[PDB]
Design a protein around this ligand. Sequence first.
Ligand SMILES: [Mg+2]
Ligand SMILES: [Mg+2]
Ligand SMILES: [Mg+2]
Lengths: 257, 258
Amino acid sequence: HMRFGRIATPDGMCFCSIEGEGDDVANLTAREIEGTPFTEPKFTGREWPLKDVRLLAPMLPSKVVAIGRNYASLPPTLFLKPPTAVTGPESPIRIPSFATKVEFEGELAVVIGKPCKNVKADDWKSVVLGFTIINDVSSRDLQFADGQWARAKGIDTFGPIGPWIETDINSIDLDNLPIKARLTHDGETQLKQDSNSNQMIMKMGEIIEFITASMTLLPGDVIATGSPAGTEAMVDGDYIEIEIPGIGKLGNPVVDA
Amino acid sequence: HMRFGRIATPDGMCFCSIEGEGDDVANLTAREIEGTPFTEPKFTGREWPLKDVRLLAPMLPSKVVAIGRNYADSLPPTLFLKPPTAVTGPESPIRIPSFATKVEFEGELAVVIGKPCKNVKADDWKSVVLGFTIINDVSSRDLQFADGQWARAKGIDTFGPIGPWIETDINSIDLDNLPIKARLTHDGETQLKQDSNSNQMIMKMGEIIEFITASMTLLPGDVIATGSPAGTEAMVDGDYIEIEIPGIGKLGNPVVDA
Ligand SMILES: [Mg+2]
Ligand SMILES: [Mg+2]
Ligand SMILES: [Mg+2]
């Protein structure tokens, strides 16, 4: 099945299908569709080289439910990031002056496909539209000061999502999926996160079961399935780029608000 | 000026204005409004005696932002979120799942946001509020302890009753002296199990709004739960809980095992 994105246009914006070979934007074509990812696609015929077009968050979720402490001591835990934290590829992560020690977190993100409640673990594939990347940006100093993580992870722009939604969920092997983050600081880039979905303590089905036992999930809701708990701080001028092979890259410049 | 609600009627759901004296539903009338309450509201002409329709949660908020540790009588006040899916209306059951134990209520003054805003200065807070309502910030104390993050304990479906309507004359409410009371009916006996006052707040209204909006954009319909004492009384299947805030009214919900 297809890859679905959203892009700026001159008339505003539109969903598209992303077609072509790599994860590499240079080989890819955005083809405009009418409708959403939730219905049967038909194409208007406007098509762009992906390098020429501005990708947006592939979905504007009613809520983002995130799992803390899910990466190989306290058990995995649920928290929320507000819909206002969500932004897209190349949008600035805008850091307020009072938010310090701000770190990235590359995570595999799941998009819910249909309304669901009390989903059993091995039935999880039936409620998922696809996978995407989220950068669960957090001020570690606020996280610590506040106790509840909501403010430190819920500042506007602290949830980049993208670059598109991969609906072919069998293409993604969850026993071995690298999740990488490359940080550029003072003009140099290093690999600052190197994890793998095989490190997840609660696996995909358990997560969905765990969440939906408590709360109803709606189409377009995003689940952030976790990361290592401490990474590396980012500052004005940096660039952070998460890569999950098979999905693509989610990059964002970092600026002072 | 107005009290705004949402109602279910034989014809479907709508926004409405609630008119008449008192808190007494026999005396009140619902007047359908055109569209939503954020603009100058226009009546469509349809109306019902309040007794013939059903109050719903007065908004469908994009998010619910809540403050912990905001009542005096220490770690400073802290913000958290309740998901929109937690929201329910007056008289709807609070449905407690089996894994959720020591479930307590918390009566709170709720603020409903009236326009999109960010970086609001504390002393400009009134310009962004539509009005006041009541929220019951229902919380599994056991899950709050097991999870550390309160999101699940407070975010289970139905754990955010809101209502009964939104009071837009916000000056009619004395934030320096607002009693907030809760009566729990257990085993057919009703007792006062919360007796607080908004003048116990550590961050006052304007500072809460500044604090929140310094971090997060707020949208029309978004709800702020301004706090409560951190411990009340556990509720079980069969109980009934009613929060009362004079000037707004009463928010009652039955309790059931999910
Ligand atoms: Mg995270
Ligand atoms: Mg009709
Ligand atoms: Mg509370």
